[PDB]
Amino acid sequence: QPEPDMITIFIGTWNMGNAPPPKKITSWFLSKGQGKTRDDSADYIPHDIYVIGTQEDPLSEKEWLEILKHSLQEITSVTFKTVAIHTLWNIRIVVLAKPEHENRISHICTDNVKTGIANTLGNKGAVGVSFMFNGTSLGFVNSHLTSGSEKKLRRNQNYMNILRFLALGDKKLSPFNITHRFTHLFWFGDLNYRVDLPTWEAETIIQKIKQQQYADLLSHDQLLTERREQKVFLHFEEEEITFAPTYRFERLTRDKYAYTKQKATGMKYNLPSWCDRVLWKSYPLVHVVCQSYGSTSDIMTSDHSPVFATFEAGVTSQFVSKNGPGTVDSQGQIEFLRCYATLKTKSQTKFYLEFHSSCLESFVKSQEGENEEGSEGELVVKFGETLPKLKPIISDPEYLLDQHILISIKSSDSDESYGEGCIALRLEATETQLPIYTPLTHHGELTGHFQGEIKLQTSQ
Ligand SMILES: C[C@@H](Oc1ccc(Cl)cc1)C(N)=O
Numbered sequence: 001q002p003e004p005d006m007i008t009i010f011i012g013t014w015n016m017g018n019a020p021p022p023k024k025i026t027s028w029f030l031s032k033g034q035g036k037t038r039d040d041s042a043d044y045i046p047h048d049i050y051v052i053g054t055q056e057d058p059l060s061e062k063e064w065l066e067i068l069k070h071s072l073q074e075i076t077s078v079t080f081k082t083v084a085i086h087t088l089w090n091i092r093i094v095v096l097a098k099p100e101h102e103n104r105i106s107h108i109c110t111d112n113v114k115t116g117i118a119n120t121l122g123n124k125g126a127v128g129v130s131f132m133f134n135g136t137s138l139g140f141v142n143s144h145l146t147s148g149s150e151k152k153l154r155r156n157q158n159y160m161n162i163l164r165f166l167a168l169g170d171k172k173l174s175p176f177n178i179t180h181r182f183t184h185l186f187w188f189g190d191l192n193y194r195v196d197l198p199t200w201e202a203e204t205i206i207q208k209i210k211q212q213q214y215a216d217l218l219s220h221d222q223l224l225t226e227r228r229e230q231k232v233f234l235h236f237e238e239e240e241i242t243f244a245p246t247y248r249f250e251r252l253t254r255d256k257y258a259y260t261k262q263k264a265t266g267m268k269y270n271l272p273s274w275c276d277r278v279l280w281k282s283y284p285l286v287h288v289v290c291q292s293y294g295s296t297s298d299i300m301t302s303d304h305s306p307v308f309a310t311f312e313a314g315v316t317s318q319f320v321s322k323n324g325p326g327t328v329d330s331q332g333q334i335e336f337l338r339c340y341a342t343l344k345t346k347s348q349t350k351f352y353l354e355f356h357s358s359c360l361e362s363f364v365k366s367q368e369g370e371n372e373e374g375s376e377g378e379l380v381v382k383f384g385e386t387l388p389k390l391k392p393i394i395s396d397p398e399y400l401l402d403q404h405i406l407i408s409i410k411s412s413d414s415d416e417s418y419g420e421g422c423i424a425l426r427l428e429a430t431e432t433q434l435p436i437y438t439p440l441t442h443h444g445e446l447t448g449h450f451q452g453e454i455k456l457q458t459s460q
Contacts, residue, residue, distance in 0.1 A: 003104075006315065008313075011309045012028055013055075013277070014055070020058060036290070046072070048097065052092075054091070057087075088126075088127050105132070107131055115157075128140060130181070134316060138186075159232050175406075180441075183286055186280045190276055191277045193222035194222055206257055224238075246295045258270070276304055286314045288313050324392070329395035334390035337453040341369065341409045342449045343409065344448055345418055347418075349414070351409050357392075359403040364390055369386070370382045400425055407438065407440075419442055434453060
């Protein structure tokens with residue numbers, strides 16, 4: 001039975017509005033309703049992994065697992081295995097997988113972050129799950145961010161706190177936050193970004209939604225505009241939105257948006273908004289294709305409609321050779337030529353690099369680079385031809401070209417990372433000097449760039 005080189009992943013996010021679900025929610029898992037929907041001809045074909053994020057979830061873990069498993073079994077006739085379930089307050093993540101994947105899945109981690117201080121600590125934050133699927137690391141974040149049209153900055157702060165403090169994935173990757181720990185990272189939830197138009201335009205917005213004319217609404221979506229200004233979700237992807245705003249509905253119909261200020265809303269307007277979102281970030285040159293992104297039309301217990309997104313995701317096998325794992329393969333080497341980091345920092349310490357990769361026995365520390373002044377004020381750290389030769393565990397090009405090198409640039413004085421990035425080994429050529437490039441982030445904000453050349457030697 002061969003190991004897969006692709007899997008499909010279902011991502012669901014639903015703010016349940018503290019109400020039990022209706023008896024049938026199969027449309028969610030089938031990617032049926034509005035937007036980019038799944039072909040009818042696929043309905044019996046199970047996804048390999050289903051990741052369900054809920055917010056304002058009133059159910060016990062047991063109650064929700066019984067509804068989810070029984071839903072998937074009715075669709076697929078497959079009894080899914082529970083990989084992980086983690087709840088913070090009313091924020092919940094469930095990971096279900098096909099039984100054939102039980103012995104492909106390992107290194108399961110769960111964590112949560114509570115966002116805010118005093119007043120603002122008590123119901124918002126994130127849950128997450130990570131695991132290995134054969135040679136591929138997968139991370140999943142369900143966040144319920146701060147509500148309110150006038151709190152986009154708070155939401156951006158919630159995002160930074162979650163990506164700094166959520167403890168998922170390989171703890172040996174110590175310089176790296178969750179935005180670098182995974183081959184594929186899916187971040188979804190009630191992100192709570194609103195359509196930023198005047199309150200007096202509510203009925204005009206509703207009109208536009210009834211005509212399925214979303215362009216003038218999406219141009220004011222705070223998540224799209226904040227992302228375009230690099231304020232949040234830097235280096236994440238989102239599929240084009242082609243479904244109506246998923247909030248705020250009158251319960252038990254989808255015919256009415258309930259936007260007017262009420263005591264129950266803290267006297268706040270809730271203009272129709274795309275609160276409920278799925279974004280991802282995969283390592284460079286790994287296959288990931290969104291095959292659905294939409295909302296259900298027939299699940300109306302909440303003031304939110306469920307959102308679905310499905311993905312094809314490239315996966316690799318758990319590679320064994322004569323040599324590695326357990327030793328190096330002298331027929332393999334990674335060389336870095338003419339490398340330099342450009343940092344936005346105003347500081348003057350020496351810097352060194354750390355190279356982290358599952359293709360190495362352990363991370364590699366470089367010598368300190370040479371600081372120069374850039375023409376436009378910047379710090380340029382020159383490594384030249386000084387970077388150490390990396391000794392992969394396996395030289396087979398079928399393995400090595402599928403790998404990635406995480407780079408941290410660290411202060412010699414503090415050993416603190418100033419920037420993290422990632423280089424794909426999926427090169428156009430081996431035994432050939434080729435340009436490489438990564439942006440550098442810290443706490444998920446741009447801090448610089450790393451560029452140079454790579455020369456990859458494999459056994460072929
Ligand atoms: C790894 C962990 O649990 C799993 C693994 C795979 C699946 Cl599909 C479900 C649960 C264990 N052996 O306890």
